[PDB]
Amino acid sequence: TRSSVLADALNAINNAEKTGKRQVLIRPSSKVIIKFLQVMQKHGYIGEFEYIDDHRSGKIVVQLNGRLNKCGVISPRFNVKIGDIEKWTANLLPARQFGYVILTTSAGIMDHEEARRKHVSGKILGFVY
Amino acid sequence: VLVQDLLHPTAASEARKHKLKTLVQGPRSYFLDVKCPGCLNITTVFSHAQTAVTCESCSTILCTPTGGKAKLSEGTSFRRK
Amino acid sequence: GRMHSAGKGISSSAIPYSRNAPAWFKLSSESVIEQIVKYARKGLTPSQIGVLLRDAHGVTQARVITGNKIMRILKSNGLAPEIPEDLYYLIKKAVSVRKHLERNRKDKDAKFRLILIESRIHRLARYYRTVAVLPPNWKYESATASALVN
Amino acid sequence: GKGKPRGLNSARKLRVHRRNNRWAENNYKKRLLGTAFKSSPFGGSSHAKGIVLEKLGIESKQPNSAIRKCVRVQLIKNGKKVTAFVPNDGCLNFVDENDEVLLAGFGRKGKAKGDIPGVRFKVVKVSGVSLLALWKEKKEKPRS
RNA sequence: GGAUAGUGGCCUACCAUGGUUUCAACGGGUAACGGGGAAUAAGGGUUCGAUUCCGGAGAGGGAGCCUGAGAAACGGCUACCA
């Protein structure tokens, strides 16, 4: 069955960016979806996105643009320590001057740099660049 | 393609889509208001009634179950509700 | 899907978006609960009760006409069956298919299909035991299955 | 899902799975079974001492036609019999008979070296006087 | 209850039938004393650690015991085995 809505959502985002489109439909739009895209839109990778509220689970329609290169999920969500942030960012980022590693901490969802600015750690959700 | 308005699609396409795969799913079916011949005894019935519905006054027939919509009686009158 | 087959047919209801309904209704739920219980007094299950109200009368769902559900309506009035309606139907199919094999030794198709049915019976009894709707140490067996249906 | 489990609590599956497939390797097979201790006429060592029994006229594999001038040696520490090659031009004359020789492998790590069939050892010392020094006539073989 | 410097099936009498186990018991092998550490490694790792320090065991194999705060001691004793 479906195990990660984030994997299905982000795969739909990539496959639309691979084919050149400006929009994609996201089902079923969990909380960690918006938090993941809310981080993404603050960095300008996606921009406007819309929540269609069906009474079942929700839907998301996203307006895309050619800025994004790849946005995926690392499963399972490993526990990453404040010293292990470096290893993740070197393995799964194209360079160390751009790109963000999205990882959930006790203080909400944030990138690998906002974690360093706040000096907090937690579990890893994914990556966008 | 590659630029489409998924927010507000045309209703003609929404009429074509299956009742599950549309923007927000909903029942294509409806409820009837069928006038029984003779006594008024106005009653309401499902479109896919799936049972041989009949009124209490003259319990002969109003409709017959079928694999699709319910076929109404030969002589009767109905008003869409 | 179709755990015990290869079918993938998505054929189901589509509940209306409007959680309040139907906007053309007759007298309110004070009479609906009275009609639901009287259909329950003659032995009809909530599936049958719901279908009858849905088509003969106009009831999109008893869940929007009344804040409660039909089974909970029946449960509150003390008419809940000893086993849930769904489990009673797996059991009776097992009893019917078991008797068929007692006449047909060589029907290996019935052998395959009886195995699948009892596994669904087991996965529901296990689930119903955790919920505590069914007592624990409750087991399905062929010896008492026939007496359990009726 | 690429095969292997990805669950955060499946380290037990991954470690046990790795144990079962590690046996398909050859070095891990010999090391843990201790075959070199139980087989491979040495005791897992690189050199062994034995007595020359006779000389051999082993002929060359394809494509090659030559005689290799090896010797049958019976080892001291375990009594096993091996065949060992006498490498140099005309060094079969220094290993005549009954001498107590030291042997070494060929560098193939347990298999035959060249077109010499079934020979996986070579002579490195005869009478403890460093055979190589004899070919270059630097030392003299002991009289007895 | 005995015994020990003491807790404790450590031993004894009676009583109950328990305790461990696919989350790998129990059994078998180890060319296994264990660690601090060593070699090689982008990162993850692999292999080794008899051996200068820490802990344990042994004085040819077992067993037993005197003295003494402290030994089941072995450059202490007694017996059997070799």
Added chain:
RNA sequence: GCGGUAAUUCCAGCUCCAAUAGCGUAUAUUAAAGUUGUUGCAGUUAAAAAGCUCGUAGUUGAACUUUGGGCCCGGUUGGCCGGUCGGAUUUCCAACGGGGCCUCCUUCUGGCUAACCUUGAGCUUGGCGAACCAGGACUUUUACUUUGAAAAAAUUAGAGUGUUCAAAGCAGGCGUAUUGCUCGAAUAUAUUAGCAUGGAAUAAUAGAAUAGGACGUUUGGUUCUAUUUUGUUGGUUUCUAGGACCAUCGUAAUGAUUAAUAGGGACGGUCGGGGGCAUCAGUAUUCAAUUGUCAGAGGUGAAAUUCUUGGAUUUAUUGAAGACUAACUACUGCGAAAGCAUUUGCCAAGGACGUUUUCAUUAAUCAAGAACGAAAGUUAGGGGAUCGAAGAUGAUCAGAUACCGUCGUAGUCUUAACCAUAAACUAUGCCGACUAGGGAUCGGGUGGUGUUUUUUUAAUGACCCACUCGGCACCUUACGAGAAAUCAAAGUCUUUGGGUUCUGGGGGGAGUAUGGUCGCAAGGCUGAAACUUAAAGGAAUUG
């Protein structure tokens, strides 16, 4: 690989080259090895998807519940002013997320009573307990992460510093060197477990559902404990003080998340060569009886074995046996796969569909354990018409114990019980998601004054058009993949992570040996090593 009479490859001379007080060899081990693969392997064809399905353990598993508090800076939506004639602005009430700084918490018995309504004339006599404490009854439990203490020394990285440099070592350095002075001998790392501590996103866990549910300034009562005082110490008491329990009057918007293009189930109309049992038919084949007629007929590349004037073949008439189920029959149907086609009845089952019905996460995949599993085969019967492993012959041939011709037993058929294999192939495990166009078809459905037949005329049924859900498939192209062949899956993989099961690690020895285990047996399942050695293709290209 060189060497079989011109060896740049042996043995030497000459010359040259690498490291150089060191260089080589043997074995082991490390990197190379993305050839162990958690990061990060491979499984259509090269090695490898168990024949298929079920399902305890294990792993994984839809969505849903308020955001310490302040102080500034700057953005996006709004908001009068439109003061420009339907375009934009600032001193603005708000929300949302960004950047920098400082960054209540469950109560009571008591104190400092504190921050003090405290104010005495412009420094005075009197506020509410954690801001500091002693005790009180309650306390939903976790995983995770931050920070802190502990993780001996040597060793590791590393600060300083004269062994003359360096490996080292922890020394040393500075003066009038007459009396002496002084810096050092750091620091870091140290997984996991335990302790203390902050956060509380993510992933679990529990509560209020025939309410024995909570607050309770209240009202009867039951029970227990207990200090200072009554004049002393004990034995009895009252209220008071403190638990606990029990019932109604008294308060609450009293208390159940969606209903997953998840799953189970229900219902209605269908559908299909799905299964089991009974029943029926067809022509054919063989045989047989009766009849006419004649001498050949059979077979083959050619023949021959063979049957024939006692009538072979052929014709005609009738009958029996056992098996099969043609043509219809196709890039069509059903089934987990193996498989399944004459007819009708009975029995049970099933996918898809439709559904404004029901339950509510029951789910995905699975060690151990199992159901079924073609053909051949085994045991015991029945049957034994066809064909027919062995065999007898006739050929063929140099041989022929083969291919071909004529016969021919076990079997083919069935009942009962075993066997567990197949190139059991899509050589493609299963579940879920998204990514390009096109037509055809099967089942169900939807709509359409569409066509036809009935009662010109209705309903139906059968066709037509458009669409849809599910299915067996096919066509085009590659933005994508691949090693190519090719592939809408074998794509979404160095931009490497959806879940999960199984299998593989050069070719052989070898599916052998051995030990278990199942079987009546044949054999199945499980399953090595010693030893051997650079040598066959998945794929394409040219000949």
